[PDB]
From a paper:
A cryo-EM structure was obtained from purified full-length RNase J protein. The enzyme has a preferred orientation in the ice, and this has limited the resolution of the reconstructions to 4.1 angstroms. However, the reconstructions reveal unequivocally a tetrameric quaternary structure and resolve the core as well as the C-terminal oligomerization domain. The Robetta model for the CTD fits well into the map, showing good agreement with the predicted helical segments. The N-terminal region, corresponding to residues 1–136, is not resolved in the cryoEM maps. This region is not predicted to form a compact, globular structural module but rather to be intrinsically disordered. In the dimeric unit, the protomer interfaces are formed by self-complementary interactions made mostly by the CTD. The surface area buried at the CTD–CTD interface is estimated to be 1165 Å2. The beta-CASP and beta-lactamase domains of RNase J also make a self-complementary interface in the principal dimer, with an estimated area of 672 Å2 that is a little more than half of the CTD-CTD contribution. The interfaces that are formed between the dimer units to make the tetramer are also made by the beta-CASP and beta-lactamase interfaces, and these have a total buried area of 2070 Å2.
The H. pylori RNA degradosome is composed of RNase J, a 77.6 kDa enzyme that possesses both 5′−3′ exoribonuclease and endoribonuclease activities, and RhpA, a DEAD-box RNA helicase, with a molecular weight of 55.8 kDa2,7. RNase J is essential in H. pylori and plays a major role in the degradation of both mRNAs and antisense RNAs8. The central importance of RNase J in post-transcriptional regulation in H. pylori and its participation in an RNase J-based degradosome prompted us to investigate the structure, oligomeric state and post-translational regulation of the H. pylori RNase J. Here, we report the crystal and cryo-EM structures of H. pylori RNase J that assembles in tetramers organized as a dimer-of-dimers. We also show that in vitro and in solution, RNase J is in equilibrium between dimeric and tetrameric states and our data suggest that the tetrameric form constitutes the active form of RNase J in vitro.
Residue numbers in the entry:
A (entry chain A), B (entry chain D): 139 to 691
Write the structure that this text describes.
């Protein structure tokens, strides 16, 4: 009857990152964004997670394209890999589409590059039975945008990643007029950031950071090091601008930085004298006070480089006591241990460290309660649904919305995989769809089901002991010396006896075993598993994986 | 010539917890404290670490006893297990000695219980060539103390764990006069807390917490849950006092809580009507608003209970939407992930949660910069050496000491295992001693070298594939069907072929193998390892552990 849509999301509900939405209307289908989720972060790298793709293959014939709301790795990460399975027009932003093409070429998905479809800011883009608009909106990232969707069913808003910086370094303030206009006409659906719903007071503008660089650089007497990730372009821009202001040549380490710099500079978003850029191998040729280094590893890796620098195998840079190191890695909770370790190792090198001002403690990069309320009033929407956060954060954001006078019955909290049917004046849950994650190794760059590592680590608890006994079916006992191996059981020097005790018990059982059980590998494997379970219960209270091999040679 | 001592520490320098010092003088030796170090904390439990004991066995004939500065698990943890190797008089505090005896009986070390030697507060205790005094000093813990050591070489101060609470619930203010008196006579050596050297402003007094319980309990309409660890006696005391003030029966879950309660109540430190205490199984008989539950697991375990309560197998408590849950686990960095997970699962149960006021964010329990400076002025010591913290924290504390006018040349930063010779007016490093950690399983309660799990997890990276081939020395090939097993390699349904491809290559090599290499297991194992290395390099760029077994049946 009345026009309606079916918006069921694939990522973002249950973890920072890995955001991906799929709006499904009658004979209509659009994709909003495809990020990566980073649960942990260690001394050598990060956890690599890409959203499952099973649902996409179900309704392939309907999806009218991919809609990307960032030139940033956290939100386009699966786009390149996704094309190793399916292809769809990529209607995005010129800068956002570029970096995405770099990702795909790295993923070997040039097919999907032809799908590139530049959407103009403040300019609508007719996507099948839908109209799309990219509303500039301030954020850390050099470029960004939000989506306004017009449909015969109404209008839908996806902001997602936005902090309302009154004075951004790029002084390109959000074009609030359009958002207010959409509110004035009447906005059906709203998707808004919910990350920092636990904090109060508006987040500080990046310009609050400028003084930090200025003061630190005036007092710096030696080399300056900077550590971040491949997609914090604004921060590195500020850093290099100050360095040239302080006559420090820039050394860019990590090919991701180099490609981002070249793409942006060619795109003209910034101005940079190429001669001012240097290699790490040339640092020894320059004075310390003229040396500013930029460091990043693979996609998502920042402090693997730092740790190897503290371990001194970087073979391009030697940490010195007169150095000043500025640390800003992706401040996702649970990485404090790695930061502390590297910090201690650096102080052992007698290096001054600056980390207070760039992590989430000062600048989280996502709206606080006041900013969310300001957006909510700007919109005056009928239906509010939080995305890009955990269940608690969306709960708090919904509470804040209640404080703004939004009727409860138009607010829902999603769980990944869910479907929600939304109409002109109706909204309800209809079912769940299968959502999941997949690992990718930064070296191989292939998708691996989580099942393999899951079982690997599940059996990692408790030991793994395998044995092979060459027994004669006519003797019901081992005829040739059995070979045994163990991993995680006990120290070899101290395990030689213990495992060997269970060994004698087992080979005795053979001396008078059951011929049928001995001749049938299944019975031997079951008996070995039972014996291993009993031994592990006696020793450590576990039941380790036991591999048994029977031969009739 | 001049009197001097040799203080080389065994634990505390490099991690929160696991503090243990050994002062070594001519024909003199004393032990200060033996804690446990907790690097991580998960959904099912904690990491279990006990300091190495190798050095103790070297100078056994000199040590005059064990000196314990807490009735608290974080500082006496290795004492019970240590006695499974060596025995020494335990001169401690009556309450501190009790709990320690409980730990030893759990460890089956009753031998060391006879060594129990009660030291009187404000009363000196002659320990061989040394004089010892237990100076009450405020802290979270119901009881505590610091050590004043008089010697012919001078005086040594160990405070260690102390926050200067002006108004503690127990209103037993630190007896500063003695500390000032020792400063007045002239204090040689000072060992002081250094945990929170990164923070400014004095830590809030536990009394700041009272209002929280009062207000929350006035508004509570349902059951109240409380989650902590076995040794936060003061907090549970406040909680139960308020609950009786609000007519809530107390259910103590975790035998550690029950034993601590019985020991303290028998010791008369507190007053408690036994009839007011209840079991969890009886909660269903009482109204929700009369129900307050206390939860703790094994030593160091707090949220394993919480997680099973969210998973609903606690089979004594069912979480309800009207419940109010107060969470205070040992807030060591890196547990935020578990807290977040449990919090989301609880909100899925629609439960109100209170966690802001009890973690390290409000009350870290260890002195801040102002408190350290106040101690430093109270002492006016000649030699300052920070303990109970990481290298960065001790560095910051030493900086603060510099700000207090302490000459640098009397401040050192230790690394675990080091020896430092300290005289009347001399101090220097002399060498290093072997320091290390050992795991203990909370179920078995035995000491395990870290080597076993270290190799277990080192080989956990990459797969583990073993094979056994029954070959004839006269054929240089397998004569009986070879048996293969793999763990972590690939999914069985998808690994059957791949592993089987490498299998055919290998059994072909047999068809025309080297008889001597085939007959000699070493050559077969080397060839199998090389083949596995090549295959893993081709597939995932790894070199997995390969186990080869050769038979001549």
């Amino acid at each position: 009857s009345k026009a309606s849509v079916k918006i069921t999301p694939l990522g973002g509900l249950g973890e920072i990152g890995g955001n991906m939405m799929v709006i499904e209307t009658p004979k209509s289908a659009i994709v909003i964004d495809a990020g990566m989720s980073f649960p942990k972060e260690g001394l050598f790298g990060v956890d690599i997670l890409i959203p499952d793709f099973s649902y996409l293959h179900q309704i392939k014939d309907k999806i009218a394209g991919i809609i990307i709301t960032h030139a940033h790795e956290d939100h386009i990460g699966a786009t390149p890999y996704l094309f190793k399975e399916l292809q769809f027009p990529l209607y995005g932003t010129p800068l956002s589409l570029g970096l995405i093409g770099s990702k795909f070429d790295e993923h070997g998905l040039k097919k999907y590059r032809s799908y590139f479809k530049i959407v103009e800011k403040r300019c609508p883009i007719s996507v099948g039975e839908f109209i799309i608009e990219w509303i500039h909106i301030t954020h850390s990232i050099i470029d960004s945008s939000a989506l306004a969707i017009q449909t015969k069913a109404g209008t839908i808003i996806h902001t997602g990643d936005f902090k309302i910086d009154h004075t951004p370094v790029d002084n390109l303030p959000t074009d609030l007029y359009r958002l207010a206009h959409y509110g004035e006409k009447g906005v059906m659906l709203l998707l808004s950031d919910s990350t920092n719903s636990h904090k109060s007071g508006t987040t500080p503008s990046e310009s609050t950071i400028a003084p930090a660089f200025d003061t630190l650089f005036k007092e710096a007497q030696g080399r300056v090091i900077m550590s971040t990730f491949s997609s914090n372009i604004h921060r590195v821009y500020q850093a290099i601008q100050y360095g040239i202001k302080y006559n420090r040549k820039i050394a860019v380490i990590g090919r991701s930085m180099e490609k981002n710099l070249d793409i942006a500079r060619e795109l003209g978003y910034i101005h940079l004298p190429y001669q001012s850029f240097i290699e790490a191998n040339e640092v020894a040729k320059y004075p310390d006070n003229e040396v500013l280094i930029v460091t990043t590893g693979s996609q998502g890796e920042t402090m693997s480089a730092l740790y190897r620098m503290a371990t001194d195998e970087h073979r391009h840079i030697s940490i010195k006591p007169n150095d000043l190191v500025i640390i800003s890695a992706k401040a996702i909770p649970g990485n404090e241990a790695s930061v502390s370790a590297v910090l201690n190792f650096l102080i052992k090198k007698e290096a001054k460290v600056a980390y207070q001002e760039f992590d989430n403690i000062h600048v989280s990069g996502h709206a606080a309660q006041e900013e969310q309320k300001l957006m909510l009033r700007l919109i005056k929407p009928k239906f509010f649904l939080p995305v890009h956060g955990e269940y608690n954060h969306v709960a708090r954001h919904k509470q804040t919305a209640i404080s703004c006078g939004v009727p409860e019955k138009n607010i829902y909290l999603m769980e990944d995989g869910d479907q929600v049917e939304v109409g002109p004046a109706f909204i309800k849950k209809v079912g769940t769809i299968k959502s999941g994650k997949s690992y990718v190794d930064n070296q191989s760059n292939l998708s691996i089901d989580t099942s393999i590592v899951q079982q690997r680590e599940e059996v990692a608890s408790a030991g793994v002991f395998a044995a092979t006994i060459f027994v004669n079916k006519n003797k019901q006992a081992l005829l040739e010396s059995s070979q045994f191996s163990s991993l995680g059981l006990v120290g070899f020097k101290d395990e030689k006896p213990l495992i060997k005790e269970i060994q004698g018990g087992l080979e005795m059982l053979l001396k008078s075993s059951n011929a049928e059980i001995l001749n049938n590998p299944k019975k031997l494997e079951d008996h070995t598993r039972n014996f291993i379970r009993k031994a592990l219960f006696k020793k450590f209270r576990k039941y380790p994986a036991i591999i048994c091999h029977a031969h009739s040679f």
